[PDB]
Each structure stands twice: as C-alpha cells, then as structure tokens.
C-alpha cells in the first residue's frame, strides 16, 4: 500500500513511510539529498531502541533482521549483546558518520529515550 502511495507522492511523504516501516538507512540518505534534517531518522532509531529495552521476543528477532538490512560496521562475539544491543551500536555508528549540529541529534535522542524513562 505504501508502495502505491510512494508511486504518487513527494520527498517528505517518502521519508515518513520509510521511517514507519523501519527502513532507516534509506531515510537517512534521502534526507541528506534534499538537505532535509536528520532529526526524523534519529528519533525513529531511538524509538526502536526504547521498544527493545523493554520488549517481547518476537520484536527482538525482527530487530535482528532489520539490522542486516542496515549496515553493522563490525562483528562482536559477545553473547550478552543480543539483538537489542546490536541495534544500539548501529544507531551510534550512523550518528558518528552522518553528524551535523550536535545540539539537534543528541537532543532528539535523549528526548525520545525519555519516552517513559530510562537510566542513561
């Protein structure tokens, strides 16, 4: 359905639907091309991380999956990490590479993290 919707829409609309579906890296790239800010994508990433922090097993597996759609920089052997921690590292790396005004990115991450409270 969102396929047909993209078929006849604009850039902001594309970004919106991509974030909803969970394809974050593509949203990042689109934002950069049209000079749109990266706030949306960072906030979406933070949302997923908060969800995993306190979430069910199925959510964890789907999370692992969409990480492969994105690009995890390195392979770490830690058993304790699980899918959630892998998604955290992905977000962190994306941030470091595609960084702009510091206030903006850190702000949005911290804000979204405090959706329902979190010890930083």
């Amino acid at each position: 359905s969102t396929a047909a919707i993209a078929g006849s829409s604009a850039a902001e609309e594309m970004v919106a639907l991509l974030v909803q579906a969970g394809l974050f890296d593509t949203a990042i790239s689109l934002c950069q091309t049209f000079k749109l800010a990266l706030t949306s994508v960072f906030e979406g990433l933070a949302c997923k991380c908060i969800r995993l922090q306190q979430g069910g097993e199925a959510a964890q597996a789907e999370a692992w999956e969409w990480l492969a759609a994105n690009q995890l920089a390195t392979v770490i052997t830690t058993k304790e990490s699980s899918a959630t921690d892998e998604a955290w590292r992905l977000m962190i790396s994306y941030l470091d590479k595609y960084e702009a005004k510091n206030t903006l990115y850190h702000h949005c991450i911290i804000n979204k993290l405090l959706s329902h409270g979190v010890p930083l």
């Binding site: 999956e65 492969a68 392979v75 052997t77």
Partner: protein, 91 residues
C-alpha cells in the same frame, strides 16, 4: 504404488534428530490420525528457528524459511500417502 521422496537436507540441524519430531507429528489425534495439526506443527517449526540465535551471520534467514516450507510439504505428503495406503487396504 508408493512414491516417498527425498530425505531432509538440514543446514544447521541434524537429519537424524528431525525423526523425533516426525514421530511427534505421527501421534494419533484421535484414531488413525497420524497428522498432528498443521496449525501446531507450523507454529512449532517457526519458533524453532527463532530460538536458534541468528547472530553475526544473519544473512541466511530466507534460506532457513524455505527449508521450513519444504519440511512441511514433505510431512503433509507422508501423511497423505499413509492415509491412501490405509484406504487401499480397507478396499
């Protein structure tokens, strides 16, 4: 006539161990019903691979899912053939 096809080609599993699951399926629902239930068997199969932790090399998931489907089809075929043989015997 009887037309049983190829065995299980398991990637990250043991072909011999799948036989226990085959017998679990072969439990008689009521009488002569060695077919368990597609609902249960499907759920269990889907949950099995989730338990298998897809960690660093998470690029093999489509292949894993095709395998589940192939196993299901084979189980269904076996049950159908057994039922047919039983009917033939009755006749």
């Amino acid at each position: 006539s009887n037309e049983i096809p190829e065995p299980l080609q398991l990637d990250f599993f043991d072909r011999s161990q799948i036989e226990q699951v085959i017998a679990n399926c072969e439990h008689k629902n009521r009488r002569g019903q060695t077919v368990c239930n597609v609902k249960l068997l499907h759920r269990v199969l889907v949950a099995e691979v989730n338990a298998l932790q897809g960690m660093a090399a998470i690029g093999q998931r489509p292949l894993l899912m095709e395998e589940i489907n192939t196993i299901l089809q084979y189980v269904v075929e076996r049950n159908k053939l057994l039922q047919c043989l039983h009917a033939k015997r009755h006749a």
